[PDB]
C-alpha cells in the first residue's frame, strides 16, 4: 500500500547525461500513472505494446526507469527501430519494447546563457550497441591505421563530444529530458500494480 | 563585489499587496538563478521558489501555489515578490539568494525584509 | 596507393531538387572520408568529417553517408547558393588523395 | 518533499571541544546536502558544498563527511565565533528544503 | 576570430628554392595539426605535407612525389608554420593552401598563394 517512487525519478534536479544513464529499479509498490498522463506538461508520451489508458490494471513483474537528457530533434530516435548517433551509440531499445517513452521541454533548467555543456554524449564507437547496454568507457577512438599511444591528435579523437544549450538556440536543439520506463509481464508473480 | 541588496522593512494591512525588491550587481546576472526564501520567526527556512534570470519564467514551491508572483525586470536588475491577500499567516522575513542553474546551493544571500502584518 | 574515383564531372539539377555525388574508392577506407565544398574563387570549405557527421554553421540539407568503400553526399532542395564543386577526401593511409571533383550548374 | 530531521534540537559546548552534528534525511540522496550556519537574525552563509567539499574564506575546522542518508558536520576546536544556529538543506529532489536546525550555544 | 594567411608568392626558374610562410591567429596554436594541399588545373587537388601537434613530437609526413625536397617545420611561440621547398620542378606549379586541421572539426582553410615556374 506504499506508492511507487515515480515522484523521485521525475522531478529530480540533475538527470544523468545520455552516455551514462541511471537505471532505477522500481519494484514492490503500487503504481498510478494517471498523475503521469493527465499532466499536460509532457510533450511526448508514447507507449509501445500497452495502451496508455490501460496502464493501471496491469500486474507487472518489475518496472525499470531509464532517464537521460537529449536534444530536441534526437528524441525521435528513442523508439524501436530507428538509428542515428543517439540510438546506436548512446542508448539502444530492443525491437520488442513493452514500455513507455516520456519527454519534456526542459529549456528552463538545463540551459545557461553561455554554454551549459555538462551533458556529454557519445559520438564514435567501433561497432553498434546491444539492446539496453551502456558504455561509460572513454577510449581514444582511432579512425585510420595507426594505434596512437593513448594520445589525441590526428585520426584519434575523444569519443564524448559535449552538447551546447543556449536559451535562444532553437526548438529542435533545446534540451529535452527523457524518462523511459520498461515494463515486464512474464515469469514472475505480481509485484507492481495499482 | 558580489552582494544582493534589497529594499526596506514593510508594514501592510490584511488585504493589501506588497512588493519587495532584490537587486544584484557585480556578477553576470544571467549565469545564475534566484531563489526566494521565507523564514518565519523561530523556525527553519522554506524555499519559496526559483525564478530564471533570463526569461522571467517563475517556478513555485507548490505549497506557495497561489497569491505569490516573482516579477523580473532585466535592464534595471531586480526581482520583485508580490503577495496578494495578506493574512495573519504571512508575517516572516524574506531573503533572496542566488542558487545556480546547475548546482542549487544558496551561497550569496541578502539582508532580508521583515514583512509584518497586524491591524 | 589509395585513389578515389569521382567520375561525375558535370551534374545539373534545378532549384528545389535532389542530386547525389558518389565517391568510389580502391581499398578499405573504413569511415575516414571527408567532403569539401568549393565555391569558385575561394578556398574549399568543409562539409562532412568522418563520412557522416556535420560541421557547425552549415545547413541541414547536406547529409552525407556511407561506409565500406563507396560513399555518397545527398543534398536536398538545392538552392542557387550551392552552385559549387564538391571534392571527397579520404584519410586512411598517409599519402592522402582527393577525388576528382564535380562542378554544378543550375537549369 | 524530503524531511530532514536533525539531532539534537540544541547543544551546549565549551571552547576547545569537538561535537559532531547530524542531519538524517528521509530518502536516499547521494551527497546532495549542504550545510548552513546562521547567527541571530541575519543572512546565513555556506560551510560545505555537496556534504564533503569546502568553500573559500571559511576556516578549515569545518569538515563535512558522510554519504547516503546519514550526514555529519564535524565542528572542531570551536571558538566563540561559531555560536549560532546551524542548518542542513538538500538539493536532490524537488522541492528543495532546509532543515529544522540545531541551536549551538556556549556553556 | 580565426584566420590564416600565407606568403611566398613568386616565380622561380626550375631548380630554385622558396619557403612559404603561413601565419595563424585566434586559436590554441599548440595542439593543432596543420597541413598543406595543392590546387592546379592539371592535377586537381593533391596533398603536400603535414606536421602534427606538440604531443606527437612534431612529426612529419610527406607525399611520394615531394620526398626529400619539401621540409615543413613550425614554432608555436612565433605562431606560424613554414613550408620550405628546394629543387623545384615544373609539376610543382599551382596554388598552395595552408589549413588548420584536416579531416576533423576546426577545419579552417586559408586563401592561397600561387607558385609557378617559368
Ligand atoms: C514533482 O513535483 C511537483 C511539485 O513541484 C509535483 O506536482 C504537484 O503534485 C502535487 C501532488 O500530486 C499536486 O498537489 C495537488 O493539487 C491538487 C489540485 O491540482 C489538489 O487537489 C491536491 O490536494 C494536491 O494539493 C500539485 O497540483 C502538483 N503541481 C503541479 C504543478 O503539477 C509532481 O506531482 C511531482 N512529480 C510526480 C511524478 O509526482
Residue numbers in the entry:
A (entry chain G): 333 to 526
B (entry chain A): 1 to 119
C (entry chain L), D (entry chain B): 1 to 107
E (entry chain H): 1 to 118
Please give sentences taken from the publication describing this entry.
The substantial and rapid development of mutations on the receptor-binding domain (RBD) of the viral spike protein has resulted in the diminished efficacy of currently available vaccines and immune therapies, as most were developed against the wild-type (WT) or early emergent variants. In this study, we generated two SARS-CoV-2 nAbs with potent and synergetic binding and neutralization efficiencies against various SARS-CoV-2 variants including early Omicron sublineages. Cryo-electron microscopy (cryo-EM) structures of the mono- and double-antibody-bound immune complexes reveal an antibody-binding-induced rearrangement of the RBD. However, here again, we show that, despite with theoretical collision, Class I and Class IV nAbs could simultaneously bind to the RBD and confer not only synergetic neutralization but also rearrangement of the bound RBD.
It seems that the larger the theoretical clash volume of the two antibodies, the more serious the structural variation, indicating the allosteric loop as being a critical region in the coordination of simultaneous binding. This structural information not only provides evidence for the existence of multiple potential cooperative mechanisms for synergetic neutralization capacity against SARS-CoV-2 but also demonstrates the rational design of antibody cocktails using Class I and Class IV nAb combinations.
